[PDB]
Amino acid sequence: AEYVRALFDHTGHDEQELPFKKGEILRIRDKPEEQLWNAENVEGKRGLIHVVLVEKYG
Amino acid sequence: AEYVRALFDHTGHDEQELPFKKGEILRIRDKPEEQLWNAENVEGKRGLIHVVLVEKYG
Ligand SMILES: [Cu+2]
Ligand SMILES: [Cu+2]
Ligand SMILES: [Cu+2]
Ligand SMILES: [Cu+2]
């Protein structure tokens, strides 16, 4: 809901954002392992996390 | 739902994934401009897109 707890260790890294043009059509990838959230950790660092690697905490 | 249409041009680039440890607690950032989807374009390129920059097409 508001908070999650990590089920595994995870090593930081980058992911790329698609470039696209106005009016371009895109298909959404809906497999669970491809879903991400924006998160913030105890030290204020912000970044993406994979939903499948965490669980609802609060 | 399944497909989106881009409302603006968007230049490709990277975003970082948080590193975290098993059991660590994280807060989810829920502002609209921080939400992303996984998408695929006409040429098979895969990448992240910002929800606020597109609209439901199909
Ligand atoms: Cu990833
Ligand atoms: Cu961007
Ligand atoms: Cu971005
Ligand atoms: Cu990762």
Side-chain angles (χ1 to χ4, degrees):
Chain A
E2 301 279 316
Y3 306 83
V4 298
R5 173 166 62 189
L7 299 164
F8 308 90
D9 302 323
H10 180 257
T11 292
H13 65 89
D14 292 331
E15 307 221 276
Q16 47 181 33
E17 280 204 34
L18 276 189
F20 51 82
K21 291 296 185 172
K22 191 221 165 196
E24 184 173 339
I25 294 171
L26 305 168
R27 184 178 71 77
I28 302 302
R29 293 217 54 105
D30 54 359
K31 292 183 180 178
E33 58 270 32
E34 282 164 306
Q35 303 321 321
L36 293 97
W37 284 328
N38 251 310
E40 196 173 6
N41 67 12
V42 59
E43 296 178 355
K45 187 173 183 177
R46 302 176 173 183
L48 299 177
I49 65 172
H50 281 276
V51 178
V52 296
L53 294 184
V54 305
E55 62 183 358
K56 278 190 179 65
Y57 203 52
Chain B
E2 301 279 316
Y3 306 83
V4 298
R5 173 166 62 189
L7 299 164
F8 308 90
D9 302 323
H10 180 257
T11 292
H13 65 89
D14 292 331
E15 307 221 276
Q16 47 181 33
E17 280 204 34
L18 276 189
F20 51 82
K21 291 296 185 172
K22 191 221 165 196
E24 184 173 339
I25 294 171
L26 305 168
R27 184 178 71 77
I28 302 302
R29 293 217 54 105
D30 54 359
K31 292 183 180 178
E33 58 270 32
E34 282 164 306
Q35 303 321 321
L36 293 97
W37 284 329
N38 251 310
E40 196 173 6
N41 67 12
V42 59
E43 296 179 355
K45 187 173 183 177
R46 302 176 173 183
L48 299 177
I49 65 172
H50 281 276
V51 178
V52 296
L53 294 184
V54 305
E55 62 183 358
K56 278 190 179 65
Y57 203 52

